[PDB]
């Protein structure tokens, strides 16, 4: 299958796992004070999801850069103890190996 339905599917899988639900949405900072003067390259999976639908992710690299991303704003922003740093750290593994298939 073609690079956006692979894509797709690892969405998909990443959505699907029970700690994805912090990570769907763009960051509010109703819940995180000051997040966007800390983190100037804020993502979330919503907005990959419409990258991919827009037609935006013109190698599975830049889909990959994103969602990394995601990931290292999660730690930057709460820390190395916090529960969602955790949550972050088993969606990556998840997604490492989503990626791969």
């Given at each position: 299958?073609d ?12 959505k ?86």
């Amino acid at each position: 299958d073609d690079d956006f339905t692979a894509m797709y599917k690892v969405l998909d899988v990443v959505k699907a796992h029970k700690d994805s639900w912090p990570f769907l949405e763009p960051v509010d900072e109703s819940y995180a004070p000051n997040y966007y003067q800390i983190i100037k390259a804020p993502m979330d999976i919503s907005s990959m999801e419409k990258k991919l639908n827009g037609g935006l992710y013109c190698t599975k690299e830049e889909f990959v850069n994103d969602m990394k991303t995601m990931f290292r704003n999660c730690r930057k922003y709460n820390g190395e103890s916090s529960e969602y740093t955790k949550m972050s750290d088993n969606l990556e593994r998840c997604f490492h190996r989503a990626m791969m298939k």
